[PDB]
Design a protein around this ligand. Structure first.
Ligand SMILES: [Mg+2]
Ligand SMILES: [Mg+2]
Ligand SMILES: [Mg+2]
Ligand SMILES: [Mg+2]
Ligand SMILES: [Mg+2]
Ligand SMILES: [Mg+2]
Ligand SMILES: [Mg+2]
Ligand SMILES: [Mg+2]
Lengths: 205, 137, 143, 91, 86
RNA sequence: UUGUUAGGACCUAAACUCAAUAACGAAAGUAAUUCUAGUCAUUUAUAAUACACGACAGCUAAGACCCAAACUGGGAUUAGAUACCCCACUAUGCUUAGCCAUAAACCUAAAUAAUUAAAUUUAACAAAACUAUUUGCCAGAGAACUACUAGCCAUAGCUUAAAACUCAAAGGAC
């Protein structure tokens, strides 16, 4: 890294800096005064104070990018959100007043609740003991649990789709189908948990 | 005006009574804790058998028969049989120095019996029988 | 000679190591269930996961079930290690094994992991069903 | 110099002065933060003042003696003395 | 077998603390040396080995007491440096 | 079979703690209790071809027998187990009479009277060194706790104890 270890990660929260001084906890208040005598890293190219910036979606975009083609990956995600909004608008208009209430037309809220529904609590780490492969139940961190949900989605769409379908049309159909807890990605989560149950005895190894 | 660890003296008058019973009357829980099996027998103060249990009778086998959790099950089983016969307070005479020496006493408490005292009767010869030869391993 | 004496400054293995490991675990468990080793060691109420003796027989490693609190574990580690030399004595003196290796105490936090998994697993969504040395050159004037 | 045969006549001549100062203050008998945002001189700077090679143990011992001087009541002469061994922290 | 039962090696439970009674009985049976005696008496220790063991314990106890005495004799001299700077 | 017995019988075998003690005895050896018998003065050292003793194992005869345990059988283990681990059991360990006379029988220190300085680590390591007295013993290693000889209750035994021949080392302490 070109940043010496003394450099501090930048804080790009607009409200935090403009809060009244008394509203800040003394711990947060201390850090502000300390940072006045520290070095601050320059903000990344994708780090802005925008109100429309969602960290979860920004991470999902980078996990789809190939060979540093961020423009294409962001375009595919933008087309996905639109493809999900347009699919719910059609359903909303073609639904009764009672059904209309339940229908969710916010793509950002369908994306977050979809991913959360695909996150596995426990995991399986494959081990080799005595010349056989004994995979054993494991607990997953908040970072590992989130990564697995995003990775499983980007891999179902990339592979298990017809040749002429496009990613904005397969991903939209999966975020919505996962959002209802019926997609194949949800089955991947269910299979992970069911195997861990089977290997309950092998946890010791 | 303090508690005495020493038990009541037989043949004297004491103010200590449990469930309207004197110390000499409280039934006795005989625990034989060996290195393989932990047996338990509960008897009345007149030497009449009321409950019996052991790691073997519970269903443990071989090396499991000589674990702490195996003896705990044996005590809970002996307690339940004793509680049915009408026993609430027991005097614990624990012979043996095996793994389920304490666990057998813990199971009896979990089973609803109230231990008022703990005696030890581990055989200690005063000079006796030549023990078997040391194991070479 | 007391000061001199006590200063002390200066498939066979597979089956043998499956008996020493079992017996040493059986024996050390009994040692720690009484104040025989120490009163401090008795109150720690330590449990033993397993004993692993090295193939060389250089050391005997005893795995004890670690707890949640680091302070509790740090204290238990110091007390257990200080008395390990004494524990070995007690096993040779009761004639458990004629020769016992230096005892080492290793931590076993696996019991905590298994409890965690069962917690999550119950809560999980399963889903619907010589020449140079010699003076010859010196004495001849060559050097 | 009377301390020549010590091998560190300049280090020990300085430790002789500071130890005599400490004794007079202790025999003779406020806030000690007369100077702020200052640091003790590093070993390399001390070695330059003495003009002799010092070890880490020699530097560590010198600082402890200077600290004890600050703890005790200090007249303006002492404050000027300890000032010599205080270098303004880079700003 | 001829003595009175329940006088010897008997502790009494205080307020239903059955574990504390047992833990005290263990400290009794260990301080009195019954624990070591029962453990050692599991297998036969031969007279030559018993004498070697007892001679070693005695010399081990003498050396551990004298070394503690040397440490405790200089426990008081471990204080703050009076002659700091010299 | 097991557990309990403040039931009975037995008096086999061994003597916890004390003993963190250092006593007694020529050595071997000896520590549950009581009682009886009993250790004692030769100036001191110095003894065999004589006399008397001498752990354990072993032999002989009649008993005892709780427990332990060569051997033996069974079970497991391992490529093999003729072992180590588990179970059963015998000689044997005990008593009464003899016999055998062997130990790393070692404090690896002969006994006795000195001295602590003789400018003594007088190698080193043990256990500071050293003088005198008397006896025993030793003279490179292996061959050799052997062969032969004599004595012995010993008969696959003990004590006594060489040579041929081979090597240039063997050995001790760091
Ligand atoms: Mg007898
Ligand atoms: Mg008399
Ligand atoms: Mg027999
Ligand atoms: Mg010896
Ligand atoms: Mg011989
Ligand atoms: Mg011969
Ligand atoms: Mg002959
Ligand atoms: Mg010759």
């Amino acid at each position: 890294s070109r940043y010496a270890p003394e450099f501090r990660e930048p804080l790009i929260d607009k409200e935090y800096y403009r809060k009244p001084v008394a509203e800040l906890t003394e711990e947060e208040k201390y850090d502000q005064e300390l940072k006045k005598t520290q070095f601050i890293k320059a903000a990344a190219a994708t780090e802005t104070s925008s109100v429309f910036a969602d960290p979860v979606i920004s991470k999902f975009t980078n996990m789809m990018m190939k060979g540093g083609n961020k423009v294409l990956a962001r375009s595919l995600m933008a087309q996905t959100l639109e493809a999900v909004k347009r699919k719910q608008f059609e359903k909303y208009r073609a639904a009764s007043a009672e059904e209309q209430a339940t229908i969710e037309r916010n793509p950002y809220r369908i994306f977050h609740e979809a991913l959360k529904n695909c996150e596995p609590v426990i995991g399986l780490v494959p081990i080799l003991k005595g010349g056989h492969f004994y995979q054993v139940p494991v607990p997953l961190a908040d970072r590992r649990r989130r990564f697995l949900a995003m990775k499983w989605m980007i891999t179902e769409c990339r592979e298990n789709k017809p040749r002429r379908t496009l990613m904005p049309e397969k991903l939209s159909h999966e975020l919505l189908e996962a959002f209802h807890n019926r997609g194949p990605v949800i089955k991947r989560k269910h299979n992970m948990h069911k195997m861990a149950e089977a290997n309950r005895a092998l946890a010791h190894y | 005006s303090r508690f005495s660890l020493y038990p009541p003296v037989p043949g004297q008058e004491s103010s200590l009574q449990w469930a309207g019973m004197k110390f000499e009357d409280v039934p006795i829980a005989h625990i034989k804790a060996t290195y393989n099996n932990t047996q338990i027998q509960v008897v009345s103060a007149t030497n009449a058998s009321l409950a019996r249990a052991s790691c073997g009778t519970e269903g443990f086998r071989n090396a499991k028969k000589g674990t702490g959790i195996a003896a705990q099950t044996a005590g809970i089983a002996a307690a339940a049989k004793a509680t049915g016969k009408g026993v609430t307070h027991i005097r614990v005479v624990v012979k043996g120095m095996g793994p389920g020496r304490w666990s057998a006493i813990k199971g009896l408490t979990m089973g609803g019996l109230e231990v008022i005292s703990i005696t030890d009767n581990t055989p200690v010869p005063h000079x006796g029988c030549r023990p078997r030869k040391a194991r070479r391993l | 000679n007391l000061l001199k004496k006590f200063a002390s400054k200066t498939k066979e293995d597979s089956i043998r190591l499956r008996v020493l490991n079992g017996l040493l675990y059986k024996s050390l468990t009994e040692l720690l269930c009484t104040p025989q080793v120490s009163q401090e060691v008795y109150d720690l109420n330590v449990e033993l996961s397993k004993v692993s003796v090295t193939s060389d027989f250089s050391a005997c490693r005893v795995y004890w079930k670690t707890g949640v609190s680091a302070e509790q574990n740090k204290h238990t580690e110091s007390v257990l290690q200080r008395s390990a030399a004494y524990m070995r004595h007690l096993l040779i003196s009761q004639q458990t094994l004629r020769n016992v290796p230096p005892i080492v105490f290793v931590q076993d936090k696996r019991d905590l992991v298994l409890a965690e998994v069962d917690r999550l697993l119950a809560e999980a969504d399963f889903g619907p069903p010589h020449r140079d040395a010699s003076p010859r050159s010196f004495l001849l004037g060559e050097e | 110099h009377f301390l020549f045969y010590t091998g560190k006549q300049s280090y020990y001549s300085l430790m002789h002065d500071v130890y005599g100062k400490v004794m007079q203050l202790e025999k003779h008998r406020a806030e000690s933060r007369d100077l702020i945002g200052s640091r003790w001189l590093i070993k390399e700077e001390l070695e330059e003042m003495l003009v002799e090679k010092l070890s880490d143990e020699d530097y560590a011992q010198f600082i402890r003696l200077l600290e004890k001087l600050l703890t005790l009541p200090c007249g303006p002469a002492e404050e000027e003395f300890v000032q010599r061994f205080r270098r303004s922290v880079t700003i | 077998a001829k003595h009175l039962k329940f006088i010897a090696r008997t502790v009494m439970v205080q307020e239903g603390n059955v574990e504390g009674a047992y833990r005290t009985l263990n400290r009794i049976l260990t301080t009195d040396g019954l624990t070591e005696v029962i453990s050692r008496r599991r297998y036969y220790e031969k007279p030559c080995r018993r004498r070697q063991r007892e001679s070693y314990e005695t010399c081990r106890r003498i050396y551990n007491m004298e070394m503690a005495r040397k440490i405790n004799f200089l426990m008081r001299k471990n204080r703050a440096d009076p002659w700091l700077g010299c």
